[PDB]
Amino acid sequence: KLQSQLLSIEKEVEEYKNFRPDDPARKTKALLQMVQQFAVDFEKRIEGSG
Amino acid sequence: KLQSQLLSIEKEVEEYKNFRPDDPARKTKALLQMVQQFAVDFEKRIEGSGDQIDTYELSGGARINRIFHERFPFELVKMEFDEKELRREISYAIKNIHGIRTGLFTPDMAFETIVKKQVKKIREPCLKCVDMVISELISTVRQCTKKLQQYPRLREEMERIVTTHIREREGRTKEQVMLLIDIELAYMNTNHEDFIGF
Amino acid sequence: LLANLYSCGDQNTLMEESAEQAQRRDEMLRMYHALKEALSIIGNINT
Question: N or C: which terminus of chain A carries fewer CB neighbours within 10 A?
Answer without folding.
Answer: N
